Amino acid sequence: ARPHVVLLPSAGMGHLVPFARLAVALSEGHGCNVSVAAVQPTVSSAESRLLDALFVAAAPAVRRLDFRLAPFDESEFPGADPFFLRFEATRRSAPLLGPLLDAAEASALVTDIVLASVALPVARERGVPCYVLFTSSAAMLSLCAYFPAYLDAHAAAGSVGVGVGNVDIPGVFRIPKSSVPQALHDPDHLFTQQFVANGRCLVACDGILVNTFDAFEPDAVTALRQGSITVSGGFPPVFTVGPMLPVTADYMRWLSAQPPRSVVYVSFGSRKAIPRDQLRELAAGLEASGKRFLWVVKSTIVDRDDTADLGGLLGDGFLERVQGRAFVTMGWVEQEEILQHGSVGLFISHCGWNSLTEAAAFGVPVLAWPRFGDQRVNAALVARSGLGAWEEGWTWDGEEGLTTRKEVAKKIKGMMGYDAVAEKAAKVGDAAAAAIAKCGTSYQSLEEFVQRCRDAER
Ligand SMILES: O=c1ccn([C@@H]2O[C@H](COP(=O)(O)OP(=O)(O)O)[C@@H](O)[C@H]2O)c(=O)[nH]1
Numbered sequence: 271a272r273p274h275v276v277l278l279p280s281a282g283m284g285h286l287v288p289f290a291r292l293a294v295a296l297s298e299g300h301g302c303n304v305s306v307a308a309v310q311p312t313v314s315s316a317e318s319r320l321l322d323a324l325f326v327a328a329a330p331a332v333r334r335l336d337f338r339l340a341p342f343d344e345s346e347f348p349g350a351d352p353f354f355l356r357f358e359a360t361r362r363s364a365p366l367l368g369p370l371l372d373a374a375e376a377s378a379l380v381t382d383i384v385l386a387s388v389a390l391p392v393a394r395e396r397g398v399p400c401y402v403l404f405t406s407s408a409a410m411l412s413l414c415a416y417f418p419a420y421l422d423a424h425a426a427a428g429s430v431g432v433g434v435g436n437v438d439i440p441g442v443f444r445i446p447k448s449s450v451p452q453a454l455h456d457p458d459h460l461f462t463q464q465f466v467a468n469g470r471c472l473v474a475c476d477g478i479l480v481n482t483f484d485a486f487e488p489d490a491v492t493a494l495r496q497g498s499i500t501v502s503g504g505f506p507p508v509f510t511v512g513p514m515l516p517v518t519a520d521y522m523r524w525l526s527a528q529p530p531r532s533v534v535y536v537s538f539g540s541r542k543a544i545p546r547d548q549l550r551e552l553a554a555g556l557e558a559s560g561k562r563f564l565w566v567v568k569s570t571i572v573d574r575d576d577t578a579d580l581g582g583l584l585g586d587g588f589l590e591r592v593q594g595r596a597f598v599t600m601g602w603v604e605q606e607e608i609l610q611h612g613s614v615g616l617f618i619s620h621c622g623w624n625s626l627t628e629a630a631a632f633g634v635p636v637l638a639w640p641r642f643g644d645q646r647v648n649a650a651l652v653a654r655s656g657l658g659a660w661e662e663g664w665t666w667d668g669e670e671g672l673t674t675r676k677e678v679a680k681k682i683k684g685m686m687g688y689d690a691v692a693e694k695a696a697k698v699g700d701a702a703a704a705a706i707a708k709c710g711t712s713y714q715s716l717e718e719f720v721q722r723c724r725d726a727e728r
């Protein structure tokens with residue numbers, strides 16, 4: 271009998287991608303039926319394409335469950351990021367999850383961290399076990415879990431403390447103040463209110479899945495499994511299930527024509543647009559590096575809005591001058607496919623977590639260029655694990671300062687010129703493939719989670 275697992279993602283590819291890979295892992299790999307309760311329409315078109323493809327490729331085990339949004343008035347959070355606004359619109363629709371869950375006869379609910387504080391109560395009154403899929407690193411899970419106690423300890427009669435400094439996560443390490451997600455400095459920020467509420471409820475859920483592997487983050491994973499992080503001393507089981515594997519266009523025809531390990535692939539993720547002054551230094555750094563490069567560019571946060579002319583954003587001269595030696599697009603690329611290709615030798619990445627798991631699975635060295643949110647925490651893991659290297663001094667969003675074309679070009683040449691870089695990254699690939707293979711720590715963790723789902727048949 272196939273356990274029924276209901277999966278409840280939030281908005282953006284960073285939250286949807288790992289849910290689509292989990293669904294396939296649970297269905298093909300462990301004999302589960304999976305219902306993915308996703309909101310329609312999606313903020314980005316890339317989410318729509320991924321959902322459409324998921325429900326074909328992984329049918330009949332994986333199925334769509336329609337989840338309608340109550341109307342939400344965005345006037346409440348003026349100037350908020352569109353994905354954060356969809357996070358909140360979806361959180362206030364959690365009512366509707368109750369009926370859906372009764373109808374699905376779920377063995378278990380797996381909810382996005384983003385939605386955990388509102389999904390867990392609904393699961394409890396419908397009698398369904400409720401697990402959280404944390405979508406970023408174990409280091410960031412350890413931050414999310416400790417941040418409420420941090421804020422509490424720094425609360426002093428006569429106020430609720432504003433700002434964040436160095437965060438000494440028990441039994442893990444120190445997050446320097448400058449690596450704290452920018453939004454967390456404001457306890458009233460839309461993201462922060464969600465992040466704090468979701469961290470508070472984590473002690474009271476049935477377990478937490480993380481798309482990482484023990485050898486990648488041994489200290490963070492060891493602290494989460496002992497419960498160091500909560501001082502109360504009680505934490506749910508943590509299942510390390512990653513790096514989860516993925517489920518011919520002009521850029522691929524180009525790429526296959528290039529020599530092995532020759533191409534610098536460049537992308538800052540699905541929801542970041544680099545300001546133009548920094549964009550020009552990156553263009554000229556790539557040019558000056560002398561390396562072949564494949565560069566994905568965004569002018570807006572949401573792909574649907576992106577109308578800018580590539581020529582108009584970078585330079586019509588630049589584009590003609592790098593013809594042939596390089597490939598530059600403002601459209602979507604199937605990055606999972608690029609990162610498996612033998613012709614890629616370097617990934618300049620914003621250190622979004624799903625991007626890092628992809629470079630980890632395939633052993634691709636990472637030039638870390640974090641921009642916001644969790645990305646400086648994740649960049650320190652890049653450096654720490656030997657997946658790549660990270661110049662801590664490069665500025666990120668909200669800081670003044672510009673990484674120059676010389677800095678880019680020199681760091682690109684060093685990464686590809688120093689063989690230890692490719693070798694360290696390949697050792698991460700080796701450990702990642704082992705983790706998800708039969709005898710690996712991630713395969714076993716996933717087997718244990720599926721066993722829990724089997725024991726919940728009603
Ligand atoms: O042009 C693009 C940009 C992104 N991605 C994928 O989108 C996800 C981005 O998620 P991540 O957590 O790295 O960052 P976010 O976009 O949430 O900042 C990853 O699976 C990438 O492989 C892609 O396939 N093509």
Ligand SMILES: [Cl-]
Nearest residue numbers: 487488489490
């Ligand atoms: Cl660690």
